[PDB]
Structure formats: C-alpha cells, structure tokens
Write a protein that binds this ligand. Structure first.
Ligand SMILES: CCCCCCCCCCCCCCCCCC(=O)OC[C@H](COP(=O)([O-])OCC(O)COP(=O)([O-])OC[C@@H](COC(=O)CCCCCCCCCCCCCCCCC)OC(=O)CCCCCCCCCCCCCCCCC)OC(=O)CCCCCCCCCCCCCCCCC
Ligand SMILES: CCCCCCCCCCCCCCCCCC(=O)OC[C@H](COP(=O)([O-])OCC(O)COP(=O)([O-])OC[C@@H](COC(=O)CCCCCCCCCCCCCCCCC)OC(=O)CCCCCCCCCCCCCCCCC)OC(=O)CCCCCCCCCCCCCCCCC
Ligand SMILES: CCCCCCCCCCCCCCCC(=O)OC[C@H](COP(=O)([O-])OCC[N+](C)(C)C)OC(=O)CCCCCCCCCCCCCCC
Ligand SMILES: CCCCCCCCCCCCCCCC(=O)OC[C@H](COP(=O)(O)OCCN)OC(=O)CCCCCCCCCCCCCCC
Ligand SMILES: CCCCCCCCCCCCCCCC(=O)OC[C@H](COP(=O)(O)OCCN)OC(=O)CCCCCCCCCCCCCCC
Ligand SMILES: CCCCCCCCCCCCCCCC(=O)OC[C@H](COP(=O)(O)OCCN)OC(=O)CCCCCCCCCCCCCCC
Ligand SMILES: CCCCCCCCCCCCCCCC(=O)OC[C@H](COP(=O)(O)OCCN)OC(=O)CCCCCCCCCCCCCCC
Ligand code: HEM
Ligand code: HEM
Ligand code: HEM
Ligand code: HEM
Lengths: 385, 54, 93, 248, 248, 93
C-alpha cells in the first residue's frame, strides 16, 4: 500500500495537502484563504528574524527600530515587509470574512468552524495592537494608554485591574516589556488555533460557491489547486513588492517615526487603517461603558449570525435583494471606517450614529425579514394554487 | 470515608492551585521601585499670563 | 481506530453523494489541446457580459454613499467658511 | 475642523527623485550637507546618522576624517580615572549642539526642535511640506490675526504659528559655485538631503525593487500560463446524460 | 590539581542562620552594616541593594533617610541644563566609592575589587569561605614561600596570594556597647550581613518553603491513599483458567 | 479518514490479540475492600525479598568503580605530595 498513505507523519499531510477532495466549482476566494495562510507564515518567519536583532527596554526600543532599519545588512526590507505584510494580512482577512458572510459558509454544519475563526479574528486584532505598542512611537503610546484604560469601565473595581495590566501608575519598563513578550508569544497561540481551524474545516469539506451540495463530484487537491494557490501568492508577492519598495509609507500612517513624548500629543491621532471601523462605532455613541461594551458587542453580533439567517436556500448567489443589502452593508463598513478617520464635528455625529444603527440593524433584523421575504417569494412564484 | 479522602485531596489541591495562580499573577504586578511616588515643585514667578505650563 | 461522529462527506469510493447511473464524463488530456483557447474573444465578450449582469448591485450602493459623502463634505466646508458666528453656534449645540 | 488649524494641502511638486526609476540626485547632497552645516548649525540635531555612511554616497573618504578631527567625544577613562576627549572617527554620530534637552527650551524661546534625522518621514506629505514650509512664509502676516510677540507666522503649519526664525535668506552660503544666493536653492538642497537621511538606502532599494518586479511579473505570466495548461484537463470535459431503463 | 593552587577545603562551621527553620540573627545585621560601613569604607562596592529594603529588616523607618541625606546622586538639570546634585532619597542605591573602574585599579595596587553585593552567593562553598578568608591570615607570613611584593599571603585563597591586606584588627568599631575587640565578632557581623545582601529574601523564602512542604507532604500522603484505593479494584482480581472443550 | 497501515494493536473490541476462552476475571469493587489489606507484612517482607533477589547487580559495578576511583584519587594525591620531581616527571613528562 502506497507509502504516502502509510507513514503517520506523511499520512497526516496526505489527507490535507495531497488528497483532499475540494469541490469542483472553486473560485479565487479559497485560494485567497491559502494566500492568507502563507502571509501568516512569512509574517512569523520575518518576525523571528526581526526579534533576532530587537531590544526591549523602553529607552532602547526606538533606537532598536532605527538599527534594524539601517545598521543591519539588508534589514530595512525585513521591517517594511513585516509592517506592510501585517496590513495586507488584515485586509485579506477582512476580505476572507466578507466572502464567508456573502456565500453563506456560516450555515449550521460549520458553526464550530466559524466560531473558531472569529476567535482567530479577535486574537489577531489583539496581536496587531500589541505589536503597534511594541514599536512605541509617539501615538502608539497614547493608543496603549487609552486601550489599557478601556477596562476601567468595569463596575466597582476598575482601577486595580488596569493598574495591574499597565504595570504600575505610568508607562514604563514593565509596560513595554510585558507588551513585547506577549506579542512575541501570541502568534504561536494563533498557530495552534489555526491548526484547530483546519481540523474543524476538514470534517465537512468546503462550501460550493453555488450554495448547493458538493458531494457529487470533486477533484483531487494536489496538481490542481496548488497552482491556483501559486498564481494568487505570486500576485501577492508582486503587489507587496510594489508597496514595500516603490511606495513604502502609504498603508500606515507617518506618525510612528517619532520618539515617545508623554508631554505633547498631536491633534490628529488615529489608529491604523484596519481598526477604523470599530473606532468609529466606539466614538459614535456618547458614553464610556456603552462604547466599551459595544465593541465586543460588535464582535458578538458577528457571532450571532448563524441560526438567524433563516433562508432555506443557502448563500446569496440567487437573491437580488439579499446581495444588494450585503453590498450596502460592505459599503456601510468602509464608510464607517472612513468617517472614523475623519474628525468629529457637527455633520458627523449624526452620520456616525446612523451608520452604526444600520450596521447592527443589518446584523440583527435585516437578514431575517429579507430572507423570509425571499423564501416566500420563491415559493409563491412557482406554485399554481 | 472514601469520599472524605477524595474531598480532602480536592481541598488541598484547590488551596495549592489558588496559591500557585496567585503567585504567577502577582508576578506581573507593579514592582517595588516603580512605586516611587515622585514629588515636584513648580516656579510660579516667571510663568506667562496667557500660557499653559506642564 | 476510535470511531468518530457522523460526517456528510466520505472519502473516495464511499464519498456519500447520491448514487447515479448513466452519467458519462470525458477528457482530452492537457497535452492534446491548445492551453490558450479563446484567450481574447472569451476574455472581452464574457467580461462585458458579466460586468453588464451585475452592474447595478455595485453601482447603486456606491452612488448612494457617494452622495452622502459629498453632501457631508460640502456642508462641513460651508460650516467653517465665514459662517462660524451665524450658523456654527446655532447648530453646534 | 477649519482650514486654519488644518494647514493648506501640499501642492504636488514634480520632484526630481519622485519617480519609479529615478534615484537621489546626490550630486546635490554634496551641497545639501554644506548648507545644512552652515545655516542650521546650533538649532537642530540630526543626531541619528553615523559618518561611516556618507562616504560612498556623497563624499569620497578623507574629508569625513578631516571633519571628524573637529569634534570630541569623551573617550574611555585613562589610568588615573580622569575622563578625556579624543577626536572623532568613522564610528560616531553628529552632535546636536544642545547637550541633552534643556538648552533647547532655554535658547529657542519656545519648544524643543525635533531631530531632523527622521523628520521628513513623520509629516504628511513628507517629501514636500519642508520646502513648502521653508519658502512658504509670507513677508507680512495676514491681516486680522494676532500672534504672541516674538513668534513668526507660517500659513502652511497647522495652527499657523511656528517659532522658526526665517533664516533662509540670500547671499549667505555660497557653496563653491554660482548657484546659491537664491532662497530656492538652499531649501531644495536641504529638502533632498533630509529626504536622503531618513533612508540612506534608496538607490539599492529601487534597484532591488526593479529586479523583484521584473522577476515576479515574469513568474506571474508563467504561472498564469501553466494554470491555463493543466486546468484544461477538466475545463473542457463534457457530460452526456443517458437516462437508464426504468427498472426496479 | 595541587593543594597550593586550590586552597584549603572549607570547614563545616556551626552557623546560626543555618537549618531548615531558622531565620537570620538580624539583631546583628543592625551592627553588621555598622561595621561594614566603618571598615570597608571606600574599597568594595555593594552597588546592588536599594535603601528601600533596609527598612523593616534591619532599620525601622527613618534612620535610612537620616543617612540618605548624607550622599549625592546627580539628578535632572535645572532650567539652564547644568546638572544638579541633590540629597539622596529612599529609593536609590548605595554609591560605589570608586567612581567608574579606573580609580579602583589605581588604588588597590592590583586587581579589581570584586562586587560584594553577590560575592558570597558566587564562590564555591561560600557561607564559611568568606569567614575563612577574613580570619585565615597567619600572624606571620609562611616561611620558604615566594611571594610578589605588596600582596599578602592566604592559606584559603586558591593560589595563595590576595591583593588586599587584613584590616580586621581589635577595638576599632565599638558598635554601641561592650562587644568589640574580638575580630571574630566583626567577621561574624560582616558575613551575616553579606549573606543577607546576597538575597534579602531569606525569612520569607524559608516560611513559604515550610508552608509548601507541609501542604505537599499532606497532599502526597492523600494521593498515596487514593491510589491504593481505586487501584485496588484490579490489584486483587483473580483469574481461573478452564481447559476449553477440544472440538473444531 | 484515509485507510492506514496494518497495526498490531487497535481499539476496544478489535484489540487484535489472540482470541482467548475460559479466562474468567473476577473483582471485588474498591469500596468494600479495605484497601490496605496488607500494609506492613507485604511491605517489609516483599521489599526485603526483592532487595535480596537483585542485590549483586548493583553491588558489583558500584564496588568496582568505587575501588577504581579510590585508587585513582590516592595515586593523584600521591603525585602532588613530595613526589613532583621523581614520580610526576616519569609519567606526566
Ligand atoms: C520515600 C522515599 C522513597 C520514595 C520512592 C518512590 C515511591 C513511589 O513512587 O511511590 C510508591 C509508593 C506506593 O507504592 P504503589 O506503587 O502504590 O504499590 C506498590 C508497592 O510497592 C507494593 O509493595 P508493598 O506495598 O508490599 O511495599 C511497599 C510499601 C513501602 O512502604 C513503606 O512502608 C516504606 C518503607 C519501606 C520502603 C522504603 C523505601 C523503598 O508501601 C506501602 O507500605 C504502601 C503505602 C503505605 C502508606 C499508606 C498511607 C495511607 C494514607 C495515610 C494518610 C495520612 C494523612 C496524614 C495527614 C495528611 O510506595 C511507598 O509506600 C513509598 C511512599 C511512602 C513513603 C513514606 C515516607
Ligand atoms: C536527584 C533528583 C531526583 C529526581 C527524582 C524524580 C522522581 C523519582 C521517582 C522514582 C520512581 O518512580 O521509582 C519507581 C519505583 C519502582 O517501584 P515499582 O514502581 O514497583 O517498579 C518496580 C521496579 O521497576 C523494580 O522492580 P522490582 O519489583 O524488582 O523492585 C526492586 C526494587 C529494589 O528495591 C527494594 O527491594 C526496596 C528497598 C529499597 C530501599 O528496585 C527499585 O525499584 C528500587 C528503586 C528505588 C530505590 O520506586 C520504588 O522502588 C518504589 C518503592 C518500593
Ligand atoms: C487562569 C486560571 C486557569 C485555571 C482555573 C481553574 C479554576 C478551578 C480550579 C479547580 C477548583 C476545584 C478543584 C478540586 C475539585 C474536586 O476536588 O472535585 C472532586 C469532585 C469529587 O467527585 P467524586 O466524589 O469523585 O464523584 C462524584 C460523586 N458524588 C459526590 C457526586 C456523589 O469531583 C468534581 O467536583 C468533578 C471533577 C473534579 C474537577 C475536575 C478536575 C480538576 C482538575 C484541575 C486542574 C488544574 C489544577
Ligand atoms: C486599505 C486601503 C488603503 C488605505 C488608505 O489609502 O488610507 C487609509 C484610508 C483613510 O485614509 P483617509 O481617506 O482618511 O486620508 C488620510 C490618509 N491620507 O482608510 C479608509 O478609511 C478606507 C478603508 C477603511 C475602511 C474599509 C476597511 C476595508 C476592510
Ligand atoms: C515550589 C512551589 C511553587 C509554587 C509556589 O511557589 O506557590 C507559592 C505557594 C505559597 O506562597 P503563597 O501563596 O502563600 O504566597 C501568598 C502571598 N503572596 O506555595 C504553595 O502553596 C504550594 C502549594 C502547591 C500545591 C500543588 C498545586 C497544584 C495546582 C497548581 C495549579 C496551577
Ligand atoms: C494596449 C492596448 C490594447 C487594447 C486591446 C486589448 C486587448 C483587447 C482584445 C480584443 C480583440 C478584439 C475582440 C476579439 C476579436 C477576436 O477574437 O479576434 C480573433 C482573435 C482570437 O479569437 P479566438 O481565436 O480566441 O476565438 C476562438 C474561437 N474562434 O483575437 C486576437 O487575436 C486579437 C489580436 C489583437 C490583440
Ligand atoms: C520510627 C521507627 C519506625 C520503625 C518501624 C517502621 C515501620 C516498619 C513496620 C514493620 C512491621 C513489622 C513487619 C510485619 C509484622 C506484622 O505483620 O505484625 C502484625 C501487624 C500487621 O500484621 P499484618 O496485617 O501486616 O498481617 C497481614 C497478613 N494477615 O504489624 C503492625 O501493625 C505493626 C504496627 C506498629 C508499626
Ligand atoms: C490564520 C487564519 C486563518 C487561516 C490560516 C484560515 C485557513 C483557511 C483555509 C485553508 C480554508 C479552506 C479554504 C480556504 O483556503 O479559504 C479556510 C476556509 C474558511 N475559513 Fe478560514 N482561515 C483563517 C481565518 C479564518 C477566520 C478568522 C474565519 C472566520 C471568522 C474563517 C472562516 C473560514 C470559512 C467560513 C471558511 C469556509 C470555506 C468554505 O465554506 O468553502 N477563517 N480557512
Ligand atoms: C500575523 C502576526 C503579526 C502581525 C500582524 C504583526 C504586526 C506587527 C506590526 C503592525 C508591527 C508594527 C511595526 C511597524 O510599526 O512597522 C509589528 C512589530 C513587530 N513585530 Fe510583529 N506581527 C506579527 C507577528 C510577529 C511575530 C511572530 C514576531 C516575532 C517572532 C513579531 C515581531 C515584531 C517585532 C520585533 C516588531 C518590532 C517593531 C518594529 O520594529 O517596528 N511580530 N508587528
Ligand atoms: C533650514 C533648515 C531647517 C529645516 C529643514 C527645519 C525643519 C523643521 C521641521 C520639519 C520642523 C517641524 C515642523 C513640523 O512640526 O511640522 C521644525 C521645527 C522647528 N525648527 Fe526647524 N528647520 C530648519 C531650520 C531651523 C532653524 C535655523 C531653527 C532655529 C533658529 C529651527 C528651529 C526650529 C524650531 C524651534 C522648531 C519648533 C518650534 C515650533 O514648532 O515653532 N529650525 N524644523
Ligand atoms: C572586612 C571587609 C571586607 C570584606 C568582607 C571583603 C570581602 C572580599 C571578598 C569576598 C573578596 C573576594 C575573595 C575571592 O576572590 O574569593 C575580596 C577581595 C578583595 N578585596 Fe576585599 N573585603 C574587605 C575589605 C577590603 C578592603 C578594606 C580592601 C581594600 C583596601 C579590599 C580590597 C579587596 C581587593 C582588592 C580584592 C581583590 C583581590 C583579588 O581578587 O585578586 N577588601 N574582598
């Protein structure tokens, strides 16, 4: 019997890379998920080779970044690739999310998969914030201050927990030390969670783009879809090169390159582009505890999507109104991010409040009523009496 | 008698787990020298009228 | 091995899909045909047909939110343009 | 937020090195350093870059040693423990004239002057906005604005108030040639100089980027071809459903 | 591996702080610090212990300050940037008397004076070894042994040559009462002090260890019992064979 | 899961060991057994008999190496004891 399917260390890899009957009608989004995996692995590798030459003290953290910038042979490539690959990783993860939401992969037979995934999502957001603190530029210090102080909204005892997590009464050596150590720790936990993600995926294959049974025919994994991954990963490499060489400082914001100074802050302090959507809803509602709870409530209202989509027909490939509403929702999401980026003045508070309302409304009530209307229309159209 | 023995083990184990977790968690708390409650003085003779001193 | 829970997809041979009879497939092998068939004709024609089919679903939301964004920007500009003493106060509160 | 505190958007100058293949015109750094040392002497810092990188990009060699013989850097203690000072070498950084931080707020009659070594990376519209700020100052402040005595106006800075004593005049530097004594020249040279010092790695970065782009585009096209090739073994298949005899 | 190069093996003294349940005799640390400050003076460093940990262990609250205002520490400058000296506070280390390193090798007439803050935790044996060094000097140098000028003999130092003399004489400390003029007393005080300063955590460590060993012993015995209990369902099963009927 | 290779041990019900018949295992349950049925007799007697039955296997090697080590040590300190010119130089040099 073939040695590929006999040895255990290889019988494992056979069932996941060499023989896994993916569905016939795959498009480029699952290849995009493979792209995301490779982005994660290159991020890990370049992170190791980064921390190989990175200090940790607060007084010698910025100097360490300039040192990795220039005084190491072929090192600026490492730093820019780390940062821009992180940003591209977040964008591709957002697009992975939006794909999953559109095609109805969140239908019941994969709820464990979807929950595990959103756990990777929240973990990855935490990792990004942790590393951005690890830089300790100028506005990263204020971002760390605010996000640590976020937990002070907890009722009764709130000061003790924040002072514990914040290493004292000031941002000092233990603060950045612990932040960097945890940042260097967490992605391996992400790796564990994503091997669980793969485990949970393998139980029931991957969904068709048509939202219909794929058990009829399937084509082998290797020699067919490995190249569908290769083409897209080459596209990723070239676009990342374009952003890392010719146009380095676009995706990020040109403020990190300042020594930390807890005395003066600029009037324009914003998160990096992939945290604007939640920052908008945080600054939208006029309360502290309400905003703190409503961020994690945005994550939870993401969670609640299954057993709410009550369309008997899976996916949004054959529902004009549902797909139109999904597009209004994604444009809602980008509008939310951009308004968060812009300053808050008279014509913006109302804008943001309405934006959050339509956002959460789409999660809660738009999907069920629209879905029911689609289902009843589908029944009534093709019935005589 | 058997359940009493098992419960005694559980009680000791719970006390020990509490102690170990408390040790590990209090490892991350504020250290001693960080608790240096600094005190500063400010000269008010030369401060400008319409200016903010930090 | 330890038996596991019920699964909606088996492996080769016991794949689990409905049994069928009379279906016939074919193939011509990669080496016996030109890799780039249509290349341009299918490119242009199918690209335009697809873009025509789904144009409105991306046109309408983009237009709506662009209209919102333009109105908001223009009102914000008017607010802080020789109007901070006669319009800004009456709407800021 | 009003435009007064937001600052005018930087006009899109057609810069010399703002090109996909263009390199720094370090025929101009050779005088950018000259003007920087001559005019911004005791005001800013540039305290990040080491002299062992100017050689081979701007200067030849012996000049940096001849300059380093002008600064002292507090060598290791002697036998008697009395600290001494020795001339600089090719492993030292430029000394900002203000010792640590305090003389900065003591002498500028204002705030700390930022280290220029990375300044044109940490402002929106980095490449410009420093030429804009250095030459965009007006001779007379706009009518109807009151400013603290002793400060200067700048419409391009957020808030329109900056402590920059406008030392960018003419007939001041006289590099080696007939080219200075026009305020555009020194501003342009210092702008390119700073844009270099933020990353004295542009030339090889652009070369490597060109190599990578070419290689990756070629590999992209090859991969597109091969995908069209081996996928054709299934894309062209057909099905002819022949229903079975209804026997059961 | 001769005896001369290795030194006398350390004896087995009957310590006062040794033993699994014994704390320090830190009614004498209060005078061990006194004698150390008198006699070590400007020779050894002890630059790793902070005056906020000699409070509540050897000194009550205020004496530590009342000597802390007798030093200088060179804190932040004034408005003119001139560095300023201010009296010491309660969270600052003891200053090593020799400024950086060089005055040390200029005054000892020899090698570096080793750091005392962790010396007795960083020598083979060590609890007695420092005592042996301090009291091991013969009153007359050994006969028929070569010795370089300046250095004094030691039958305990590996190699038998120490760069420091023996300033441990009699009637030269006078702590508060009748006790000195016994060089063994000063040696005992200083060794107890240094054994404390190597780890200002002896008492708490011993207490926590006692608590943990009691809890673990009880838990271990309970686990023995439970293993004897639920394993007993198979440590006593009996098998009885039966010859099966021979038919096939 | 894909089929795996032949194995000499399986899961419950398909252990794969030789089929047995006539074996009749009993039990007593742990609650009604008084665990320490033998706690001093069994301890002392079994411990001593087991120590006796496997005594030599550690006495012989340990004694051999202890004798070796003692001889080596005694010769070593005999070397560095008023013998560095007559015994040391005849082997060391
Ligand atoms: C200690 C140093 C040596 C430790 C070696 C490691 C021992 C180990 O891994 O556990 C085996 C452990 C249990 O053995 P087992 O694997 O369960 O049974 C196999 C027997 O060896 C089968 O042989 P056996 O039982 O005939 O002889 C072994 C005998 C050996 O036991 C002895 O009598 C020890 C002296 C002879 C052996 C000397 C060392 C060998 O063991 C016993 O007597 C059984 C344990 C008796 C203690 C029962 C305690 C009941 C609960 C008490 C609760 C009290 C609560 C107080 C408040 C809290 O053996 C011990 O008895 C050693 C631990 C007891 C040390 C007491 C001090
Ligand atoms: C420094 C770092 C220390 C780190 C320690 C880490 C934990 C070590 C735990 C040792 C352990 O698991 O002992 C196994 C355990 C071995 O006994 P067992 O679990 O019955 O296994 C049978 C042996 O393989 C032997 O089979 P057997 O029935 O012929 O037993 C003869 C017995 C010979 O010992 C005796 O005859 C008992 C008298 C010894 C006193 O040999 C030993 O097992 C003696 C080893 C301990 C002394 O230790 C004992 O000897 C239990 C006490 C009786
Ligand atoms: C960030 C912190 C993360 C870590 C945070 C951890 C927080 C919690 C720590 C553990 C606290 C409790 C520990 C002790 C539990 C215990 O002793 O439970 C034993 C009981 C006894 O159950 P039994 O008597 O054998 O069987 C039941 C028979 N009845 C009585 C119902 C008729 O059985 C039960 O109650 C059920 C089974 C025992 C409990 C499961 C095993 C515990 C393993 C603990 C491992 C860690 C130590
Ligand atoms: C990523 C696209 C490039 C980002 C960019 O180009 O810039 C960052 C822009 C805003 O930048 P800005 O429009 O505020 O202009 C200031 C900078 N010159 O992010 C956005 O709000 C658009 C995307 C955020 C919301 C959609 C999230 C999609 C997932
Ligand atoms: C060696 C001991 C290391 C542990 C330690 O050091 O824990 C310190 C504690 C005592 O210190 P404390 O809690 O009294 O400190 C209190 C004031 N800060 O020890 C113990 O109770 C040991 C008890 C452990 C019993 C086994 C626990 C098993 C479960 C662990 C779950 C995690
Ligand atoms: C830089 C700016 C470039 C602008 C043009 C971009 C490319 C647009 C290509 C559109 C070609 C014209 C429409 C299709 C005509 C056509 O199909 O003509 C026939 C061929 C291919 O047909 P076929 O053999 O694949 O049909 C297969 C079944 N009979 O076409 C070409 O070889 C066009 C060559 C010029 C490019
Ligand atoms: C501090 C110094 C301690 C020294 C002693 C350490 C412990 C050694 C104990 C050895 C007991 C003697 C050997 C067995 C004798 C015996 O069997 O005598 C009878 C009983 C146990 O009989 P049984 O139930 O095991 O018979 C089992 C078969 N029916 O013995 C004891 O209950 C001794 C109790 C005092 C201890
Ligand atoms: C490092 C993070 C992740 C990795 C490596 C990963 C990897 C994969 C892989 C390999 C697949 C198979 C198809 C494909 O490649 O896209 C897949 C599918 C999927 N992933 Fe992920 N994923 C990650 C994160 C997430 C997250 C955060 C979610 C959701 C919150 C998610 C939801 C899904 C879903 C729904 C599918 C469905 C495929 C199908 O229905 O066809 N993934 N993922
Ligand atoms: C996908 C997971 C990761 C993401 C998304 C991520 C993201 C980031 C980001 C955004 C920064 C800020 C750097 C910048 O401002 O230019 C950063 C910094 C850093 N990361 Fe990560 N990181 C990840 C994993 C890792 C790992 C695994 C390591 C180490 C093994 C690592 C090491 C570092 C280091 C050393 C910095 C230093 C800051 C710098 O020099 O700018 N990262 N990371
Ligand atoms: C001609 C070359 C110079 C360049 C390129 C330059 C560049 C800069 C830049 C980029 C800033 C910060 C602007 C920002 O925050 O957006 C700045 C601030 C400053 N510069 Fe310079 N500078 C130059 C000459 C000088 C000179 C000669 C002085 C002193 C006489 C000076 C004193 C300052 C001060 C005091 C500030 C900060 C105070 C304020 O914000 O008002 N600079 N400079
Ligand atoms: C009673 C107070 C003193 C104590 C407890 C003390 C303790 C020690 C210790 C533990 C050593 C290291 C021994 C070895 O290397 O293992 C040492 C060496 C030394 N001590 Fe002292 N010492 C004292 C007094 C002095 C004085 C007064 C001087 C200077 C005048 C001095 C100068 C030195 C020097 C120079 C060494 C280095 C010798 C060498 O390592 O080659 N000590 N002392």
């Amino acid at each position: 019997m073939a040695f590929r399917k006999s040895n255990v260390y290889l019988s494992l890899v056979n069932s996941y890379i060499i023989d896994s009957p993916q569905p016939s009608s795959i498009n480029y989004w699952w290849n995009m998920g493979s792209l995301l995996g490779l982005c994660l692995v290159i991020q890990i590798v370049t992170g190791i080779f980064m921390a190989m030459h990175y200090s940790s003290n607060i007084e010698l953290a910025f100097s360490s970044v300039e040192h990795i910038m220039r005084d190491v042979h072929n090192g600026y490539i490492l730093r820019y690739l780390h940062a821009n690959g992180a940003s591209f990783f977040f964008m591709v993860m957002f697009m992975h999310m939006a794909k999953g939401l559109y095609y109805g992969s969140y239908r019941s037979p994969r709820v464990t998969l979807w929950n595990v995934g959103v756990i990777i999502f929240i973990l990855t957001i935490a990792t990004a914030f942790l590393g951005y603190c690890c830089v300790y530029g100028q506005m990263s210090h204020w971002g760390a201050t605010v996000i640590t102080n976020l937990f002070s909204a907890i009722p009764f005892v709130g000061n003790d927990i924040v002072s514990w997590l914040w290493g004292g009464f000031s941002v000092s050596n233990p603060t950045i030390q612990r932040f960097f150590a945890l940042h260097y720790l967490v992605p391996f936990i992400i790796a564990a969670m994503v091997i669980m993600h793969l485990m949970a995926l393998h139980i029931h294959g991957s969904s068709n783009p048509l939202g219909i049974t794929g058990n009829l025919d399937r084509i082998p994994m290797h020699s067919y879809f490995i190249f569908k991954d290769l083409v897209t990963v080459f596209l990723f490499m070239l676009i990342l090169a374009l952003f890392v060489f010719y146009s380095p400082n676009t995706l990020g914001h040109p403020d990190n390159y300042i020594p930390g100074n807890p005395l003066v802050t600029p009037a324009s302090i914003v998160p990096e582009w992939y945290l604007l959507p939640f920052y908008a809803i945080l600054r939208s509602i006029p309360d502290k505890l309400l905003g703190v709870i409503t961020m994690f409530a945005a994550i939870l209202v993401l969670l609640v999507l299954p057993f709410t989509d009550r369309s008997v027909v899976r996916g949004n490939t054959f529902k004009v109104l549902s797909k139109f509403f999904f597009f209004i929702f994604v444009f809602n999401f980008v509008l939310l991010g951009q308004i968060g980026a812009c300053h808050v003045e008279v014509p913006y508070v109302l804008m943001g409040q309405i934006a959050t309302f339509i956002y959460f409304a789409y999660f809660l009530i738009i999907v069920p009523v629209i879905s029911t209307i689609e289902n009843v229309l589908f029944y009534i159209g093709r019935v005589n009496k | 008698y058997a359940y009493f023995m098992v419960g005694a083990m559980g009680l000791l184990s719970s006390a020990g787990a509490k102690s170990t977790v408390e040790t590990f968690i209090s490892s991350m708390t504020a250290t001693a020298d960080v608790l240096a409650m600094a005190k500063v003085e400010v000269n008010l003779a030369a401060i400008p009228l319409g200016k903010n001193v930090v | 091995g330890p038996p596991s829970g019920k699964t909606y997809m088996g492996w080769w041979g016991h794949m689990g899909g409905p049994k069928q009879k009379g279906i016939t497939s074919y193939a011509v092998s990669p080496y016996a045909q030109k890799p780039l068939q249509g290349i341009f004709h299918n490119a242009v024609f199918n690209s335009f047909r697809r873009f025509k089919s789904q144009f409105l679903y991306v046109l309408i939301p983009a237009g709506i939110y662009w209209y919102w964004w333009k109105n908001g920007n223009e009102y914000n500009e008017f607010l802080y343009s020789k109007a901070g003493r006669e319009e800004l106060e009456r709407v800021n509160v | 937020m009003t435009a007064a505190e937001h600052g005018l958007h930087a006009p899109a100058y057609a810069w010399s090195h703002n090109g996909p293949f263009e390199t720094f015109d370090h025929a101009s750094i050779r005088r950018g350093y000259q003007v920087y040392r001559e005019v911004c002497a005791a005001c800013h810092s540039l305290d990040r870059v080491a002299w062992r990188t100017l050689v081979g990009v701007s200067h030849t060699n012996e000049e940096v040693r001849n300059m380093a013989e002008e600064f002292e850097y507090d060598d290791e203690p002697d036998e008697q423990g009395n600290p001494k000072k020795r001339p600089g070498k090719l492993s030292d950084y430029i000394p900002g004239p203000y010792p640590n931080e305090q003389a900065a707020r003591a002498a500028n009659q204002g705030a700390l002057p930022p280290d220029l070594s990375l300044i044109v990376k940490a402002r929106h519209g980095g490449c410009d906005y420093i030429f804009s700020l250095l030459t965009g100052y007006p001779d007379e402040p706009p009518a109807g604005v009151a400013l603290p005595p002793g400060s200067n106006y700048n419409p391009y800075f957020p808030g329109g108030s900056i402590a920059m004593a406008r030392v960018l005049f003419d007939d001041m530097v006289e590099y080696e040639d007939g080219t200075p004594a026009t305020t555009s020249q020194m501003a342009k040279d210092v702008t390119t100089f700073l844009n270099w010092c933020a990353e004295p790695e542009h030339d090889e970065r652009k070369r490597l980027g060109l190599k990578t782009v070419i290689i990756l585009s070629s590999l992209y096209l090859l991969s597109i071809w091969v995908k069209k090739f081996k996928w054709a073994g299934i894309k062209t298949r057909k099905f002819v459903f022949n229903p079975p005899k209804p026997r059961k």
